[PDB]
Design an enzyme around this catalytic site. Sequence first.
Site, short mmCIF file in Angstrom:
data_model
loop_
_atom_site.label_atom_id
_atom_site.label_comp_id
_atom_site.label_asym_id
_atom_site.label_seq_id
_atom_site.Cartn_x
_atom_site.Cartn_y
_atom_site.Cartn_z
N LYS A 1 -4.91 20.28 -10.01
CA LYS A 1 -5.47 21.01 -8.88
C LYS A 1 -5.32 22.53 -9.06
O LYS A 1 -4.28 22.99 -9.51
CB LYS A 1 -4.77 20.60 -7.60
N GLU B 1 -11.44 23.38 -6.49
CA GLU B 1 -11.25 23.71 -5.07
C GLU B 1 -11.65 25.14 -4.73
O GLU B 1 -10.85 26.05 -4.85
CB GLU B 1 -9.78 23.50 -4.67
N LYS C 1 -13.05 19.71 -4.17
CA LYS C 1 -12.27 19.81 -2.96
C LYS C 1 -12.73 21.02 -2.18
O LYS C 1 -12.16 22.11 -2.30
CB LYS C 1 -10.77 19.90 -3.27
N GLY D 1 -7.59 22.20 5.96
CA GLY D 1 -7.31 23.52 6.51
C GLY D 1 -6.35 23.50 7.69
O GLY D 1 -5.34 22.83 7.69
#
Lengths: 344, 343, 343, 343
Positions: free
Chosen positions: C141, C184, C226, C269
């Site tokens: 990630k 992401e 993402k 978030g």
Amino acid sequence: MQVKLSQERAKELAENASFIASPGKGILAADESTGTIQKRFDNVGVENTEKNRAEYRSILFTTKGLGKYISGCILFEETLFQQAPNGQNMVDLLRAEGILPGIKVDKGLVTIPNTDEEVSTTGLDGLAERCQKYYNAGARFAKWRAVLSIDVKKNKPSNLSILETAHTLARYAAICQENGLVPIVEPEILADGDHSIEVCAEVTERVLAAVFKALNDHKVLLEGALLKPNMVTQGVDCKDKPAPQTVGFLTSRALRRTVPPALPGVMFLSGGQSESMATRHLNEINKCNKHPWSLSFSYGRALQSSVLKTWNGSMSNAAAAQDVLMKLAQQNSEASLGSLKYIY
Amino acid sequence: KLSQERAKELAENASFIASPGKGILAADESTGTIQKRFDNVGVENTEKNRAEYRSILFTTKGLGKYISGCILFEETLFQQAPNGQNMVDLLRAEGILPGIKVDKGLVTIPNTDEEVSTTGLDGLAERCQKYYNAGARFAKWRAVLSIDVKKNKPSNLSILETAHTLARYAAICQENGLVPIVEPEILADGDHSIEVCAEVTERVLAAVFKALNDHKVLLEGALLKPNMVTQGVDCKDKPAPQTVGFLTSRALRRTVPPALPGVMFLSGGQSESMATRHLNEINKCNKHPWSLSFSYGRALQSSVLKTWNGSMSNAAAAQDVLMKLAQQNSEASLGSLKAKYIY
Amino acid sequence: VKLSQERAKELAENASFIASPGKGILAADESTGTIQKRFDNVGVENTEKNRAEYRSILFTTKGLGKYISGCILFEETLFQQAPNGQNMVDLLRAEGILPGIKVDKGLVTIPNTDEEVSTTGLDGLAERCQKYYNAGARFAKWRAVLSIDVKKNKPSNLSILETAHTLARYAAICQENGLVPIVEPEILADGDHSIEVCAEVTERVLAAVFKALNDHKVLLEGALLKPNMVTQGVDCKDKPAPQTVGFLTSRALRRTVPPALPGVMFLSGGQSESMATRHLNEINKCNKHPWSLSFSYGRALQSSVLKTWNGSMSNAAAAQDVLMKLAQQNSEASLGSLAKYIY
Amino acid sequence: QVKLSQERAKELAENASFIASPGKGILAADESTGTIQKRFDNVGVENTEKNRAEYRSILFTTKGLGKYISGCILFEETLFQQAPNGQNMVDLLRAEGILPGIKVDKGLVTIPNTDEEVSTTGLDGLAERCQKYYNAGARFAKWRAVLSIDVKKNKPSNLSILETAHTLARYAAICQENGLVPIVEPEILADGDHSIEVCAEVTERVLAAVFKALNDHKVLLEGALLKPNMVTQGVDCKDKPAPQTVGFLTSRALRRTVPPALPGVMFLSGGQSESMATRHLNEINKCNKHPWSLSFSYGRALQSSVLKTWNGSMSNAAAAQDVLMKLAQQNSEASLGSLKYIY
């Protein structure tokens, strides 16, 4: 009709572009279409007949010694194929003064879909064939106007505006060079609105960086091209008037930051500036530094307003009109040499 | 300035053209393209003979079961059949949307090795409005790219020019009521491998779709007309039809967002039969979020023209042949015809 | 350096596994400074022993692998032991969950922007990926951050360009070294922009991201995205329906993400546990989609779990049940089974 | 501070103009441990820290070197090193009137899915290193990117160029944020048998890309320098062009791409001999008037004979220094075109 630019044709373009950029000389923009010349003639009470257009242009082009200050004259298609009242071809009048004829080759502006009234310039269809025809009639350079707006509240000029401007200018320039004409690349950022000179400087630098990258991607020969940009100024409705010195400096800087030295000349547009300001600004641009290209003018209204007003539609004022053109041509010649008589 | 109602009409028409089991008949040959084909059946290439031939196509009973749109040349959009009926009304009676070719031809890009640009942006909005008023609801514009490994074709400039101009054309069409068919045709000329075609196709489509995004083209109201992925015409390799199916599917899956309702393939120089079989294999190899169908000219008409042979005695037979080819391509569009490559 | 067929096959199999229908990702990759905050909010001392205890409770939740396909760790955790000495990685294997690893090194400001940021960590990335793969990680990630501010023209061209280029480099390097990259591009919900503005920005940013992925030859089949959902800003006074968030998120993705990508695993978030779930569900319900639409949640899977644990092993069982409750509902949301906007 | 202030812009511009002073150039003494190994192997000298310190001290105590040398680029070791008499290396440079510079890149790694094309590493923590280097006395930086020409494999690829331009622009922007003038070095290697014309074409394309990126990243050209290859035929090319041709094509590439606000172009010499590096510089300057300095940033071309003369003994130090002065002098004269059109 050849697709790859040869050494000999590159050389003719380079020589012509350097000629147009000759120190102390600039361009007379006499390329008003029928519709545009209608308004200029309306302002002085003169009927827009083909006869009056021929008369007025013949007066311009028989101005004795004009060639000392003017290297090129941009024409509208009508005028390129036109004769003066005495039977002389307009192109031959220009040749007799030592002036290269040029030709407007764009077909005007349309809106880009999904923008807030931003525009694209039309005219690529049949451009090669028009260029060939104009070359055979004596034209050696071309002009195409792209238009961009500044509006800070609306994020103008949009990415799409700049992208469209750059790509389309580069295509036009490449096609001109393929067919014997030096392109004047004109990305005009309008001075409409109330933005500051700093915003114009930032926008002008971004726009020119995009324009020159595109010219490179499309294999435009800079040695055989010219640039006609806006000067860097505050918006027309901006309440802060900077000095002509700041206009001079930020204009020089925008160009020094973006324009490779192989380009032989930058021939400014004057937009809505007065005859005097257009000259004062050019002078200031030249005085603030040494530059690797000529910094000169390609002016229309700033060389003709007072001339039209003096002519006032009568051959009896022809001589007086020609003297006004020589005064304006002369003072802009001096301004182009920085001889009119750092912010990071 | 695209409104909710214009966007909606575009999306409905684009989804209609991409209806399951349906594809496009391309009948947009110019006088000059029609010439050779009418020469071979001994028919004079006059306006009235083109109207005769095309009226046979457009009165084919039940053609609308397999054909959702038909691309016309301007002449045909404004033309009457021999009995005085408008060609456009014939298509309407079939339930087929008329479409229109809006490009003006190819010119070479300066300083390239004979790579080309498509012309026609000047006056395009006005042409679109006139064609819309006459009944057109979709448009066609063809860009052409070439593969040549040695000369590094397609050049960056060919791709940039292709992407930018297609996006401009697509935006103008949508502004003026027409669904644009975006056609970036990579020619099969040369001797390159199917793997080279795959790599080039994926790169080209990535550039095209990025430009469509930059220009705010509504994918929901557009269609794509790409080449299939195949080896070059002079390539000695002969990959299996299953491989064409797989590499074409992969190339599209890797590049075409699902908001686009349909991919209507061009057939190039493929035979009638190969065009159908390749289409079937493309659909058989995976599930896809857009229709995978056809936009065929010669691959629907060669045998039709030859059967007609310039005489109304054979018109009913010709119509029967069109229906057969239209049906097999309908079936192919649903995947229902009756070392290793990375996933 | 060149992606081999077997390497490509392993990436694609692992990316499809992470995107398995009904499963999502538990984001457990809070750095020391981030988990300080979470532990502060519940009065627990941020020691390594407390982190090991807390993570070992998460990773011993019976049946967690029915709902969770992957778990992103911070470097510390990847090499750590639970209180009984078992490796955290082995706990995840026992659950049938793939380990993943955060490989970025945080944000720094881009010069001459208004506080827009760049993500660091490309130096030594290949060698980190190699070490993490050997320890058991199979996905990675990397988080980039963009801001919306219409007055300041954020996100700037430079922000988007830097985001797209740098995400593509990271993705390519991961793939070269055996890890499926999660890409992401997080557009923050800070500010008072409308949901429409978020839709428009999200679409622009994803178009740039996928074009860059293409340019860097990143294998979409062996990658995951993402993204933020499309929502109004935190200070926006519109409060659109959850159905609208669903519709506009689905639209933005359908308009930009090629179907070769196997899964879109949303970040939540600042949304609540319930809203993160409800939004996921609405996104799924409003259309068919060619990629999984699931979750990669941290706070939204753990806030209640943490509050229930409260720093005591006597609550381990209770905390685990809460985690299963939230994992379950999000599993169901991922299957969609828990005048107007342009189509 | 993240936005470049007028005062900090002014410092960068003054330092860059000083480095570009007419008749002066750069001594590139920034060989890493592994590179200096090779240079020392040629002269039978052991690669120890003491030998590196000794050799550099001899360079930096050459009487009057600052008449020809405006700047000296150091490797990190040397920047923090004492000479054998206990004086700091940086103080030796200050006593000469020479600005210290620092190499800030961390070397090359391969870009995935290219044919061994490379990316330059070092962005992580660059701001902090720049600050530490500035505090130690450095006022300019260097970062080397590398591109290859191979016409049969279409090198340099689009990816190589994109990566090169983006990463150089990031590095340059970060340097300027932290008080150092960046030397932007996109080195196109002369390896292979391509013609001077191919090098001309590639150089112009690469420079156009680099300058556009510098603009996009808001790099101040007034406070930067360029270190490009000359335009030459490949090392194995069988056609030797005239030194005048190298002169002309190099000038032309720069005139076509480098805006005049940049104060200096300081050439790398690559594999060129000491004599050819000087002769070529002279021809570049002779063929035109130019709006930036055209000068040198030479390593081997200022040092090969110096090393050979030194031979690992302090008893050859004065003789070595005289060799340095001779070469520094001739390159100084060459930078003024005073050694003693193709479209």
